[model samples]
Target: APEFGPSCKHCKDDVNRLCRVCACHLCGGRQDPDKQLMCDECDMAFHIYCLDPPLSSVPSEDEWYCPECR
Candidate 1:
């Protein structure tokens, strides 16, 4: 297990904590924020709206992780 925070893993830049998702240092897109999803394995952040399937709203349960993190 690891710790999660409001910071970009790749760039290690400061990021907005609430209502903000981590951005991919490579691609530069708002990572899924629906549930404050972050890459458990990598340093990618995903916005709920940016999801492939597109999340309707923040998830109540289940943690979300980026592609590489998953």
Candidate 2:
């Protein structure tokens, strides 16, 4: 599935066409356009708001980790 809607609504868009990131680890969808976080190790973007006990804002860290990569 490499062709999606106005903004990859169906997880059908190519990684390049949409975004070079994973879907919200929690929501399984809803890729926020601006508030994405990247794991320091894997470099895959993760949805911030979708994170459990979501951070009020970006954490003040030199590096961040994703659920899997952490």
Candidate 3:
């Protein structure tokens, strides 16, 4: 499934919710939900724009890790 990690503690639902902790770790934005990506270890979500260099597209790999985890 597209969903990853445990349920968000802030939202108590899915990872794709408005929970800032569960959503983008940087901007904490509610827009571009489709652009959100979750870490394999931390389960923290990060937008492509939230990245340091900013990714142009979603990664080709299936499992992804955050900078801290990587």
Candidate 4:
């Protein structure tokens, strides 16, 4: 059940009260916008540390997938 609002500056998608496009799905946090990764499959955002195993940095790959999407 993903939801959306106005277009986001981060993903250029949509932003909702719990904006998965501009914030983290795990924490609903938008602190480090740069660290937020947008999933290519669902287009939701997830923070590096918010990931289950945690990532030191963004992946070099052109596309990233969220757990649900993966």
TM-score of each model, paired residue for residue? 0.42, 0.53, 0.68, 0.69
lDDT of 1: 0.52
Q: lDDT scores for all predictions?
A: 0.52, 0.63, 0.79, 0.79
Expressed as tens digits, the lDDT of each residue in 1-70 for candidate 2 is: 2684364545555543433334554455544646777788877666777677777577777599988877
- Model 2: ten consecutive residues of lowest lDDT: 15-24
Model 4, TM vs. native: 0.69
lDDT of 1 by residue, 41-65 (tens): 6645665566677667766655656
Higher-ranked by lDDT: 1 or 4: 4
Q: Order of candidates by TM-score, top first?
A: 4, 3, 2, 1
Poorest lDDT segment (10 consecutive residues) of candidate 1: 17-26
For residue 50, give model 4's deviation from the true position in Å: 0.4
Per residue, candidate 3 scores C-alpha lDDT tens digits across 2-68 of 6877665677765465567856788766678788888989888889888988998889787998887
Q: After superposition, how far is residue 38 of candidate 2 from its true place, in Å?
A: 0.3
Q: Which pairs, if any, clash in model 2?
A: none
TM-score: which is higher, 1 or 2? 2
Off by over 4 Å in 2: 1-31
- Between prediction 2 and prediction 3, which has the larger lDDT? 3
